[PDB]
């Protein structure tokens, strides 16, 4: 028989179970993690040998939300689970971000971790469960890994931190901050936040890091009980028996070259010293093969810039450590789009557009927790010419979707709630050119494009991409980092939010010994640079324009009395069908208390108002008035006062006298006095000659 | 700061704007182009050095219609733009065809030009805006390129030409010709026409070329103001001693080999002397192989055939200049299909099929220009076995769409109007074998398959793929060119139309000096070959068949009153769903009471008529049942005229107050028949003792 090893927790008043040892025995390791009636099966396979022509490390992650886990049949025509959506692909990225730095330097063997959701109760989100499982599975396997990461989701409600909140706490919460870290340090931070201050969110991360300690302790128990024999993988030695000679021949001139002011002359001189030292040392294989020699020269370049940045003022572009690049910000740039903007920051440029739509058009996405409507849609397009090089159109990847979601979190915090503004809005960003941190340039552009469209957005929103360099006790916090300056980042972090408070924070710490002391001054420097940007944006547009641009659809609403419903509906929706086809306009959106008119243009809304007021309780008459002869017989006449239908006036009303014959009223089209003058009564007219 | 550079020529009665230097500054060039307000952002990136040992030119073009440009959010479930589409990959082909020949010979650096539509006004089509933008972007970049190209769309209304017509001007027009050219020559022409004559179509191309020199002038002043420096490209020399030496060792016998009458012996002898010279001739610029020597032999082969064709009548097929391949035609080839044909023309063959459908099966086409729902659908399938090769069936090439649209333009003109013929018709063509033009063979087959399915088309249509070879004052028009006469096609052109006139025209010119005198004699030779083909097509079948084939859906209508309409529906069309599935018959509700009915045969439709009348008729009439029924009670009785269900009746209206007792019979199971009396309180049911439709 087979037997399973089982451990239990109490993690934020939930009972986590790490079952292992009875499933997928051919895989390098496997665990089923369940937290509360919610379970993910996660399994690692890592081959022992990689083809010696492999330079990069192929860690790969897949996360799959099998719909049977929610106990219901798929909605797709093929009745089968489809491609990864936003939802699967973003969760695959959050699991990958903490695991990739923990693997040892120069580890290159191919590793694949596959996480399947197999149960859910709607109250508990599976992503945090999958993160615990991935660190358990990797640390149970023999594979070289620097200790198991925990994970915590932290909510903020009634000025109190709440560990691993349910959907019921999160709908009320002002914060959704996720932490992942080892025993020693935070490794990843991610959040949406309702304009909290810096010291509130740096409280949230350290609370989240303290609470996840139980998970890291329990995984260390399970690894003692059921852990495989460890791998003996060792790296190739650092020197490769040429390090010192090439360092001596390159470094003197190469370290000089970065003093040169002109980007072109600097690049040229660096290429000259590189090509000369490549041409000089052609004595052997792996010099006649440039690759190993060139990889060493590229490493010298990184070392010389890194040392300059710590002590000396000049950067890769000669700016001061904190000197943000120049801005200019055009608005209303595109002729027929609802609102549009062209935000720039050095050589990163983000053309952004906002587009407005009716209650019909909104996205109804289906996910394991629930099928649900939302009304703010953000799409991020990154075409290849943006980086000055050619390839396949679109070029879609996890990073481009990551950047889309991060930007949406930044400005979703500051969107109006539906009662102030009833439209669905799509914001769509074309990255016309990029050389670093294009995601934070896209949130600045979205803030412009919404104000320019005349959405009642609460406040202007901006973002900055920072970094930090550290050596022992020495560190420098730098602002507006380039793509070329990525090597200097021991802590890549992005902050976006209004003057009042921050909308989003994201951090990829790559190294041990970052502290609550350091993160305080780093956020305090980001506050400065972010308030500088808003100083320019407030001059380019000052407040959202009162009136929505002329090409947008219009939605508006009027209050109605409880008796008017039968008049608005008619018989089997006949008056609705007539009104909608007269007006080319949908009106069904409300029918109790109010009616809502959702029109393709302003004239069609006015046309709808005219027609509904000519029908809805317009038939009733209380005083003496005129309305024409419309259709006639001997027995009486049909007489029109308005748009709403009017029945036969009997000839005994029409004629006072005995005769009652059609000769008295034979003339068609005649204008005549007509007052119903009748309450608590069926439809009648007291016209009398 | 950034500073955009603008210019604003007047062209087509609209205001145009060439705005540059503000966006995508990392890209080799970029332009925002805007006419009226239908703006496209178009940018080119071309790498400075070509990857080693390349042979073909990897120019790539793609064009993307972002939906936000029309001011609406996407209707897709993902609420975002996905893959390219029929209406965009075709437009990319229209941008590519005039650009591709205009690059210098031996240029093989990778170039990518990408056009995004960013605003649209529904009256002005963005495609012509993209063509002037692509010309501007390439000529502003340092890329070696033989000057700018303009593009013009020409309409015909009241016997007068109109430049750049609106959608309003176009819907009334008998023509939709697009022409693109430099100041020298009309590099591309592409056109649907409502049976215009030769003089009218060749007038349209010269008009459209005269009044677009303004675009090429304004691009030239912008290139002086804002153009980057022309970067240096030099052609790889190909003029070694071994070129002349291999020619000397090949041309004489290659001339001797091309004299051979038999196709098979010709191919055999050419392959032999190729194989011999590949095996023998040393001093190749690499260890001895095909990799230049075969490409040099291929140049001799091209020169020999081309010179023979200019000097004298003989070709590779053994036919003369004005000659057409052998034809065979047969019709009704596929059973259980509404109509089918097998048009054949030497080694080119198309199994064309027509199928009819309802107004409901019509495909809605969504564009930036608004919805463009249509009723004649053309699909073009080119499987790999058609050319005697293998692999990757069913994944379409850009030219499977390209050829499909050209064929649709050819047969769109002769389709009947909706009131004379109400069915939506899909024409599908399988190219069963091809070594010649497959698109013009598909038009010939489509006109057969529509007549065979009995669609009341105006006239039979055919098409021809001409070619022209030119050498100084020498030129020859070839009336029907194969798949390996490609090197002889300096002017590649395809024309399809009725006896009366042209329905579609397409020309790719890739030589200078094409005068109107040349284009007249070329079209006049196409007229000859096209009338020959109709001579065979008319002899296989004369006119559309008396009515549609017995399997085809026959649609008809009966008028019934609105109280029966609600009774045919029930709730949520549930009675329609039941009756339509029971009868296998389609129906449509209309508010005037004329319900439409469609089935594959008469009897199924008649069954549906009978059932909806019988079910929605009042209960007063019906079958003459013996009303023996149980469940009789003193305080009202349940009585069924028919069926298991038992309806109610009461002490008074059982027997029109003739008695005080509930039933005069006063007996359960008694035989007296029952039918409804009209009176019906909503909370009451009436089923009186009534025989023989007493009512």
Numbering used by the authors:
A (entry chain N): 1 to 689
B (entry chain O): 1 to 695
Lines from the paper:
Polynucleotide phosphorylase (PNPase) is an ancient exoribonuclease conserved in the course of evolution and is found in species as diverse as bacteria and humans. Although PNPase can catalyze the polymerization of nucleotides, its main cellular function is the 3ʹ-to-5ʹ degradation of RNA (Grunberg-Manago et al., 1955). While the catalytic core performs the phosphorolytic action, the KH and S1 domains participate in RNA substrate capture and autoregulation (Wong et al., 2013) and are powerful facilitators of PNPase activity. Cryoelectron microscopy (cryo-EM) was used to solve structures for E. coli PNPase in the apo- and substrate-bound forms and in a ternary complex with sRNA substrate and Hfq (i.e., the RNA carrier complex).
The addition of Hfq to the sample resulted in the formation of a stable and uniform PNPase-Hfq-3ʹETSleuZ ternary complex, which yielded distinct particles on cryo-EM grids. The best class was refined to an overall resolution of 3.8 Å, ranging from 3.2 Å in the PNPase core to 4.4–7.2 Å in the Hfq binding region. In our model of the RNA carrier complex, Hfq cooperates with the KH and S1 structural modules of PNPase to capture the RNA and prevent the 3ʹ end from entering the central channel, thereby safeguarding it from degradation. The 3ʹETSleuZ is engaged extensively with Hfq, interacting with the distal and proximal surfaces, and also the circumferential rim. Indeed, the 3ʹ end of the 3ʹETSleuZ RNA, marked by a poly-U sequence, is bound to the Hfq proximal face. A short, exposed hairpin threads into the KH-S1 portal, where it is mainly bound by basic loops extending from two PNPase S1 domains (identified as S1-3/S1-loop3 and S1-2/S1-loop2). The third S1 domain (labeled S1-1) extensively coordinates an A-rich region of the 3ʹETSleuZ RNA bound to the Hfq distal side (S1-1 and S1-loop1) and is the best resolved S1 domain in the cryo-EM map. Only three complete ARN triplets could be modeled into the density, yielding an interacting sequence pattern 5ʹ RN ARN ARN ARN RNN NR 3ʹ. Interestingly, in the RNA carrier mode of PNPase the KH and S1 domains adopt an open conformation that more closely resembles the conformation of the apo state rather than the substrate-bound state.
